[model samples]
Target: HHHHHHMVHITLDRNTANSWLIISKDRRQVRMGDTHQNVSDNKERFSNYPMVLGAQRFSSGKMYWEVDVTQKEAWDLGVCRDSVQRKGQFSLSPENGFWTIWLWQDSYEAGTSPQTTLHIQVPPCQIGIFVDYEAGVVSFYNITDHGSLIYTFSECVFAGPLRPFFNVGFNYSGGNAAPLKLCPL
Candidate 1:
């Protein structure tokens, strides 16, 4: 049983989501949808990522959070700068102000300029994110593998506040509809 430890409480921000994703009523989960939501874009939404940001933003100190990815087919999870671009298509990368690891087509990888490909012995059922904001480090762990190190982004020159990032890949059949849930500490 995982105790609270250093887990940071986080909530999903529905107002910051893309038009093709659904946020749970409790603001703790997200999933892809076939049709765009008939909600106002509000001039500040993820138009390209089909994702949502954490309601809480961190500017300093170390923070830890986890997302239960059980049954999810694909996703992008980690942290992004608060001022990161919401429009225009761009892949998750530090240069784009996103420090994330992603799963796509059954392959695991991290968000780096060179785009590092990760070899996970066992896919993560729940992914842990540890952010040392002041230290400029962001790390990813595979909770399913006993908190094994998956990848780490170091010396991140965070321009401003950082917010947790979550993206559920396309809403296609075969597990994509499975929501990415924030595991409570």
Candidate 2:
């Protein structure tokens, strides 16, 4: 739908296998065939904490995003964390916005007790992902007001010149969905 945001270009560095070189900070400039476009904006929060990329702002609707995890552990995935409010803040909103990926060691029966946390699958190079928001999902309130969330993206690309303000972080700790990568499916 909206393809105005930038793209993120990442290259494996020879110096260290765990690290990647931000060949092109502007993911919008990098072109991929069949594959979705990369995110160039630095919308993630938690600088130097974990590692994130993509958009910083998120709205109520369908969204798409991905991040490279060649080095980090599977437990270190993406998450949309937010604060819950007591009353209505404004237009519908979620108490929080964040995503995380991990492994589910235990098993569960059909609609049985819950013993596993929310875990997402992780890919080596390109991990394609998406999220959906329904109408009137979140509301604003006092103290914290709106349902605030922190979307986290790890293993992001960072360049000196081409990099965007929102494309350099390691995690999308808190914010909207302005930095997420998008495409038509």
Candidate 3:
């Protein structure tokens, strides 16, 4: 129920990172910092949301990326419109400009309007995201099983540029300490 396409390499944007999130010096991985740093608040930085935006933006064609979620207890991955709010704790739904899928409390869920629950037999170590702007579609894949369809958001409205989004979740304790690494194709 999905289309296979080439994946894209993405680096986390340090400027769009939250204080509790740590961006690697190489800018390829983002993880929950052991301790929150005292940093000034900014509009671009996520305050209430434990998330980060990709450095690259896409306005057309098909774009794909994968994240290594191994050993992570909670995380969210997907695409968001550039105009999406970054300051408050808003719903991660298309109505709010966020098309995402997350692993939380040992279950997978899609950020649809009603929020769809995904029945995955096994946890996925690597999750893939594919966005086709022209088709107005955003698809999620379980790369651990060689690209199995996890979920897809159809009839998406892209009012502006779309950027890759990642959230390591709120609990930065032992279980969610691992970094969400951007995997190479």
- What overall lDDT, based on C-alpha atoms, would model 2 receive against the true structure? 0.26
Please identify model 3 stretches exceeding 4 Å from their true place: 1-5
lDDT of each: 0.86, 0.26, 0.86
Task: Tell me the lDDT of model 2 at 70.
Answer: 29
Lowest lDDT 10-residue stretch of candidate 1: 1-10
Candidate that beats the other on TM-score, 2 or 3, i.e. the better one: 3
Candidate 3 structure quality by residue, lDDT tens digits, 1-185: 24445567799888788988888888888888767766767789988867999999999999888889998888889999998888876888888889999988878899987889998876899988889999999998888887888988899997899999999887635677889998876
RMSD of each: 1.9, 15.9, 1.7
Tell me the RMSD of model 2 versus the true structure. 15.9
Please provide the root mean square deviation of candidate 1 (C-alpha atoms, Å).
1.9
Order the numbered candidates by TM-score, best leading.
1, 3, 2
Ranked by TM-score, the better of candidates 1 and 2 is: 1
Candidate 2 regions off by >4 Å?
1-24, 27-48, 71-75, 79-97, 103-126, 135-185
lDDT at residue 174 of model 2 (Cα atoms): 28
- For model 3 the TM-score comes to 0.93
